[PDB]
């Protein structure tokens, strides 16, 4: 009850900033998450013992892949913490509860392969879930862990509040399927520009939470340049293994996934900043002005990739 988590001074101050890197000490990541739940939600949101047991089972169900791993989960939850803390009054009690949990869980049991690779491989999961294949699995794994004995962190909610928080988590996780982001942001852009955006409309809130999930999921591009650049190595290590596995099925992979085309990575990053990242943080900043530091950090990293192409590094 009277037991706060506290962090060393440098982490206590920097965890509040959008560009915080959670560091290489894995054993500190559970504590960092509990700290963020306690400040974002309250010390009463969750029974400490249940929350701790839930975090450790979630950790166990992330795999030892280069990028879609336990560090990505906590990193994405920290970006959500920074958004929620900078927008104190815009979100409900259930949303604050559900969204950090959704982010910790959003890539549960990821194997390092895209929805496309599962479909070309003819993986069983692609027959069980014809679209958003991995994201429906991630939500399935979240419910499994919530149902383990002593793991029900939502046990004090009413039946209808419990159904609402699991619906927030389901939509939040499904929204991390980047195939769905393009149309979600176009609708949000039109709604904001014609002045029809209404945060009392549930279908509108759902869309805005979707865009927050995309923004937290991509937050590698909003870090200081040396974090962004070193993280890109882990991203491509997965993509190039997927490309190798495409070649094993007798399919030329897209260039993004072909390690024989490393030289085109800088141009490929420009496309991604211009087609996905910048538009994402731009629309987010229009809807939630205090998230502007994400757009600014993203623009700084776009300018660093432009320098790589100009051979200035
Ligand atoms: O890097 C990412 N995406 C992208 C998206 C398109 N292309 N095309 C290329 C490319 C094309 C031709 C030749 C060589 C490379 N490289 C990419 C990387 C990414 C994905 C998911 N999460 C995050 Cl934070 C990021 Cl930063
Ligand atoms: Mg994912
Ligand atoms: Zn992710």
Curated annotation (Swiss-Prot):
Binding site for 3',5'-cyclic GMP: 68, 269
Residues annotated as binding a divalent metal cation 2: 107
Comment field on protein domains: The tandem GAF domains bind cAMP, and regulate enzyme activity. The binding of cAMP stimulates enzyme activity. Composed of a C-terminal catalytic domain containing two divalent metal sites and an N-terminal regulatory domain which contains one cyclic nucleotide-binding region.
Source organism phylogeny: Eukaryota, Metazoa, Chordata, Craniata, Vertebrata
Protein location: Cytoplasm, Cytosol
Role summary: Plays a role in signal transduction by regulating the intracellular concentration of cyclic nucleotides. Can hydrolyze both cAMP and cGMP, but has higher affinity for cAMP and is more efficient with cAMP as substrate. May play a critical role in regulating cAMP and cGMP levels in the striatum, a region of the brain that contributes to the control of movement and cognition.
Residue ranges constituting the PDEase domain according to the UniProt record: 1-312
Disease link: Dyskinesia, limb and orofacial, infantile-onset: An autosomal recessive, early-onset hyperkinetic movement disorder characterized by axial hypotonia, dyskinesia of the limbs and trunk, orofacial dyskinesia, drooling, and dysarthria. The severity of the hyperkinesis is variable. Striatal degeneration, autosomal dominant 2: An autosomal dominant disorder characterized by striatal degeneration and dysfunction of basal ganglia, resulting in hyperkinesis.
Family that this chain belongs to: Belongs to the cyclic nucleotide phosphodiesterase family.
Protein name in the entry: cAMP and cAMP-inhibited cGMP 3',5'-cyclic phosphodiesterase 10A
Chain residues that bind 3',5'-cyclic AMP: 68, 269
Tissue: Abundant in the putamen and caudate nucleus regions of brain and testis, moderately expressed in the thyroid gland, pituitary gland, thalamus and cerebellum.
Protein residues bound to a divalent metal cation 1: 72, 106-107, 217
Region of the whole protein represented: 724 to 1036 of 1055
Oligomeric and partner information: Homodimer.
Active-site residue numbers: 68
């Amino acid at each position: 009850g009277l037991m706060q988590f506290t962090l060393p001074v440098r982490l206590c101050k920097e965890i509040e900033l959008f560009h915080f890197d959670i560091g290489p000490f894995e054993n500190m990541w559970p504590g960092i998450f509990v700290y963020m739940v306690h400040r974002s939600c309250g010390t009463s949101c969750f029974e400490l013992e249940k929350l701790c047991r839930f975090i450790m089972s979630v950790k166990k169900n992330y795999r030892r892949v280069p990028y879609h791993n336990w560090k990505h989960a906590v990193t994405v939850a920290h970006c959500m913490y920074a958004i929620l803390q900078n927008n104190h009054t815009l979100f409900t009690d259930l949303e604050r509860k559900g969204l950090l949990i959704a982010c910790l869980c959003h890539d549960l049991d990821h194997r390092g392969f895209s929805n496309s690779y599962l479909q070309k491989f003819d993986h069983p999961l692609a027959a069980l879930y014809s679209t958003s294949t991995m994201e429906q699995h991630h939500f399935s794994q979240t419910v499994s862990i919530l149902q383990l004995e002593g793991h029900n962190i939502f046990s004090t909610l009413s039946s209808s509040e419990y159904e609402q928080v699991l619906e927030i988590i389901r939509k939040a996780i499904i929204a991390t399927d980047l195939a769905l982001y393009f149309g979600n942001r176009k609708q949000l852009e039109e709604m904001y520009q014609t002045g029809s955006l209404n945060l009392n409309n549930q279908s509108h809130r759902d869309r805005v939470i979707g865009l927050m999930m995309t923004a937290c999921d991509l937050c590698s591009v909003t870090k200081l340049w040396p974090v962004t650049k070193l993280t890109a190595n882990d991203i491509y290590a997965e993509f190039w293994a997927e490309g190798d596995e495409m070649k094993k099925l007798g399919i030329q992979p897209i260039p993004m996934m072909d390690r024989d085309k490393k030289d085109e990575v800088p141009q490929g990053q420009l496309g991604f900043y211009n087609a996905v990242a910048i538009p994402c943080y731009t629309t987010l900043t229009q809807i939630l002005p205090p998230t502007e530091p994400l757009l600014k950090a993203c623009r700084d990293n776009l300018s660093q990739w432009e320098k790589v192409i100009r051979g200035e590094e």
